[PDB]
Amino acid sequence: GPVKKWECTVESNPNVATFIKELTLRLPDGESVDFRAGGYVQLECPPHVVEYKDFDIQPEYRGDWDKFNMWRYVSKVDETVIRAYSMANYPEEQGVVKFNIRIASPPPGSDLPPGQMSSWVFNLKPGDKVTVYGPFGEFFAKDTEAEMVFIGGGAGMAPMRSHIFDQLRRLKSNRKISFWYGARSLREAFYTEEYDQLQAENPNFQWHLALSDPQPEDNWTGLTGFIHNVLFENYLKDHPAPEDCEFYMCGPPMMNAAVIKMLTDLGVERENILLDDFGG
Ligand SMILES: Cc1cc2nc3c(=O)[nH]c(=O)nc-3n(C[C@H](O)[C@H](O)[C@H](O)COP(=O)(O)OP(=O)(O)OC[C@H]3O[C@@H](n4cnc5c(N)ncnc54)[C@H](O)[C@@H]3O)c2cc1C
Numbered sequence: 001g002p003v004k005k006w007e008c009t010v011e012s013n014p015n016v017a018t019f020i021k022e023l024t025l026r027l028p029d030g031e032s033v034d035f036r037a038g039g040y041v042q043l044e045c046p047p048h049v050v051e052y053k054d055f056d057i058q059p060e061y062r063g064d065w066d067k068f069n070m071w072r073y074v075s076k077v078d079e080t081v082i083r084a085y086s087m088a089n090y091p092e093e094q095g096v097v098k099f100n101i102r103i104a105s106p107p108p109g110s111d112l113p114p115g116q117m118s119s120w121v122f123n124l125k126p127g128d129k130v131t132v133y134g135p136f137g138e139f140f141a142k143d144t145e146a147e148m149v150f151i152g153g154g155a156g157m158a159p160m161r162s163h164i165f166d167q168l169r170r171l172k173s174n175r176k177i178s179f180w181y182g183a184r185s186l187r188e189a190f191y192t193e194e195y196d197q198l199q200a201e202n203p204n205f206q207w208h209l210a211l212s213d214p215q216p217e218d219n220w221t222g223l224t225g226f227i228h229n230v231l232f233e234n235y236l237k238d239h240p241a242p243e244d245c246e247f248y249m250c251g252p253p254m255m256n257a258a259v260i261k262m263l264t265d266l267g268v269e270r271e272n273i274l275l276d277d278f279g280g
């Protein structure tokens, strides 16, 4: 049916990684968005000016905001903008829409304008008003009993969380499900306690974190490198029938491309790979 519209209030907007915030919007009037896991809404901003030095960035992330010279950026937006963001909540988490949003700052060294909507999102404080439109979606789980392999990176965590909670807690599914998330270091990993608990509670579910640049403080002895190599070496290379799995992918462009190439090379048919392309 026609697009619905809600004037929401910001409940919380902390960083969950150095360059990713978890934005939670409370819907008005006790309403909920009738969305499906993997779906999205559009957020809108009015004309504005935002200065990055005004952002609230939690303490452990600030050193890299200094290193990346982020505090000098200013974004001037002369007209209303709309952008899609994927729900990180699943449908049984009512009354809110929750997001994982990467700050799309200018490439280091360039003179390009900062990202219009994400810069505005990073200055949202509890109590601010945000207009939301939707729901929309196409990145939906197939209705089968096949093994599921979820692959995520960056703010692609949002539909990954939605999908995984939907399978395990709403559908109470017993399908074989794994989740593979690539990040730079432990400070860039989030929802780790949630996934560890879901693995403890659901013997059909397993997750894996691979770090590309583990930091000394991480004392990391787990998987390292790029997620497409990790998933191949530690699981798919020896899998009896990878072509029988359903793959659900959402990451930054380079990750999407590398994972899809790895899978197609293994003989997985493109029909068995569902991609949520954020268009980065
Ligand atoms: C279905 C869907 C779901 C999505 N879900 C999410 C999600 O859950 N989380 C999320 O973080 N994103 C998501 N996205 C992406 C999101 O909609 C935005 O595209 C993203 O936030 C960037 O928008 P922006 O307005 O901040 O940046 P834009 O203003 O669009 O700019 C993007 C980048 O381009 C740079 N730039 C500016 N001018 C130029 C130029 N001339 N040449 C080159 N580069 C330039 C900017 O500095 C910035 O880095 C989704 C997209 C879709 C389609």
Ligand SMILES: [Mg+2]
Binding pocket: 123, 125, 128
């Ligand atoms: Mg303000």
